[PDB]
Structure 1
Amino acid sequence: SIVPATLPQLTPTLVSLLEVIEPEVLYAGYDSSVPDSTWRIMTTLNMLGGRQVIAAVKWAKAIPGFRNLHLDDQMTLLQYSWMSLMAFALGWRSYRQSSANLLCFAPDLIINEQRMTLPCMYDQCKHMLYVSSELHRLQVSYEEYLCMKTLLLLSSVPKDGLKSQELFDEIRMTYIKELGKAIVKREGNSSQNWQRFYQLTKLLDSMHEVVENLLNYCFQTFLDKTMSIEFPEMLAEIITNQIPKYSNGNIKKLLFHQK
């Protein structure tokens, strides 16, 4: 046995340095989706709508308070709102990429005129073009656009309400106030704030007229095998759950402005 010692004489004190070490680099961008066809978007729109509604779920959950909504209602809202979110998403890209003449299904896919006017396309796409045309006529900013996309998310609910509706209502009203702010700080003057606000709001309200017709296409092609239209599992579940309620008037269209 030997006298002990403070060995090795190599015991570090990195404590002040460990307090210093904190930073790391974080990155943006989490997922991606495109269609793989043009006139055949008559079936690929559903594959895209599937991926876009799923993205819309991730996006919706990312908005504070959405995940605290009952799941049954979170899914009900995407089940009914996916159609306006899709048409509106096309709207923004169309507005900026083709001066709202063509629909832009993904940043990498624009369907041109030679396919755009075919009935398999146009019977549904003309309503999506209405939306693109209005964002362009209205000269919507990206902030104003996002406020509206966010508003559309909670715009279509059952006539009987939502299980956790009180939180949905607080979230939806926060969103409309945000649209107002996006406009007030951009147009200037007073008369232009209310005109830009109400004109953009009229698009949110008219999105329901767009949805009535776009959904009727999907409902009809979902049930009538004569149409030969394929759906992804996501929309197939949404559409079987949505048809008996939407076409029968059991779904309420929420408007943010009066006519």
Structure 2
Amino acid sequence: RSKKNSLALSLTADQMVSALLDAEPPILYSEYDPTRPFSEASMMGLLTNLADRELVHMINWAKRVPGFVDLTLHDQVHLLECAWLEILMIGLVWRSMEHPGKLLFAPNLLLDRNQGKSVEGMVEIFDMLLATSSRFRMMNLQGEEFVCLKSIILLNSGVYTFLSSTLKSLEEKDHIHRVLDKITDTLIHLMAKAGLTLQQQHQRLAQLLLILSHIRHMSNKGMEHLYSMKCKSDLLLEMLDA
């Protein structure tokens, strides 16, 4: 199906890992004043500000993910529109691994469960994120594995379409699936290099990709809450630079 000659598809596993590690966005500081007690609007202010800012840098990151700028502009936009909260979340749970009971939103913004209660609904999402981070800590998730998963989330985010598909959209989806197969290869390689048996490799690949269902769930629940606070892309198009 795909007609595109994409550099990503002929990268070796090591080269894919290197490119992903190089793409990582900068580490950002919240505008959080620790002498200021939290209220609902103040916490939602802090988080929203952090999310808006992370989104700018996420655009720059996505441009450096091999295979991503080979998609049509419309398809790049769609992936980012679908995936942004999942991508924030996986970042959060990775950073929070060595902080049992707490979510490291930023270096200066470390929140425990109880501080989630200052916003209606949000402690439910907090618990799920905490559980996810503990899961990654127990599995001893490696940085190289993390960046593979975050790229998988981006590429897998798009809405499934049958009646709503065009011949062109279908070529684009085929290109996505090839990029995804390269990332799977890269994950397996990393595992094989770390000394896992073949059985252990296939088991861990499954365990990590099953956690992505949980990330999707958390994002969906997040989105429901944001939509019900009346939140409501010309950036995206123009930053993605076409």
TM-score by length of 2: 0.71
Deviation per residue, 1:125-160 (Å, 9 max, x gap): 233223212211222111111111111111211232
Q: In structure 2, how many angstroms separate the alpha carbons of the residues matched to 1:90 and 1:46?
A: 14
The answer to whether the 8 A contact 1:84-1:208 is kept is yes
Name which of structure 1's ranges 186-195 and 198-207 shifts more when overlaid on structure 2.
Answer: 186-195
- Alignment match, 2:180: 172
Deviation per residue, 1:217-252 (Å, 9 max, x gap): 1111125xxxxxxxxxxxx459xxxxxxxxxxxxxx
- Alignment match, 1:112: 112
SS of the residue 2:105 aligns to: strand
- Alignment match, 2:152: 151
1:197 aligns with 2:178: no
| 1:112–1:197 Cα change, 3 Å | same
Q: In structure 1, how many angstroms separate the alpha carbons of the residues matched to 2:108 and 2:177?
A: 36
Which amino acid is the alignment partner of residue 147 of structure 1?
C
The answer to whether the 8 A contact 1:124-1:217 is kept is no
Summarize the alignment of residues 1-259 of structure 1 with structure 2, pairs less than 5 Å apart: 31=26, 33-37=28-32, 40-96=42-98, 98-99=99-100, 101-120=101-120, 121-160=122-161, 163=169, 164-222=172-230, 236-237=232-233
How far 1:116 sits from its partner (Å)?
3.3
Q: In structure 2, how many angstroms separate the alpha carbons of the residues matched to 1:130 and 1:183?
A: 23
Q: In structure 1, how many angstroms separate the alpha carbons of the residues matched to 2:203 and 2:216?
A: 21
The answer to whether the 8 A contact 2:114-2:123 is kept is no
The answer to whether the 8 A contact 2:96-2:104 is kept is yes
Name which of structure 1's ranges 123-132 and 172-181 shifts more when overlaid on structure 2.
Answer: 123-132
Q: Which has the larger radius of gyration?
A: 1
Q: In structure 1, how many angstroms separate the alpha carbons of the residues matched to 2:173 and 2:198?
A: 34
Name which of structure 1's ranges 112-121 and 56-65 shifts more when overlaid on structure 2.
Answer: 112-121
SS of the residue 2:197 aligns to: coil
| 1:176–1:45 Cα change, 3 Å | farther
Q: Which residues of structure 2 form unaligned runs of 5+?
A: 1-22, 33-37, 235-242
| 1:42–1:183 Cα change, 3 Å | farther
| 1:204–1:181 Cα change, 3 Å | farther
Q: In structure 2, how many angstroms separate the alpha carbons of the residues matched to 1:155 and 1:76?
A: 11
Computed over aligned residues only, the root mean square deviation of the Cα atoms, in angstroms, reads: 2.6
Name which of structure 1's ranges 69-78 and 48-57 shifts more when overlaid on structure 2.
Answer: 48-57
Name which of structure 1's ranges 34-43 and 193-202 shifts more when overlaid on structure 2.
Answer: 34-43
The answer to whether the 8 A contact 1:53-1:78 is kept is no
Name which of structure 1's ranges 58-67 and 44-53 shifts more when overlaid on structure 2.
Answer: 44-53
The answer to whether the 8 A contact 1:35-1:106 is kept is yes
Structure number with greater CO (CA < 8 Å, separation at least 6) is 2
Tell me which stretches of 4 or more aligned residues in structure 1 moved more than 6 Å: none
How far 1:65 sits from its partner (Å)?
2.7
Q: In structure 2, how many angstroms separate the alpha carbons of the residues matched to 1:92 and 1:112?
A: 16
What is the total number of aligned residue pairs between the two structures?
197
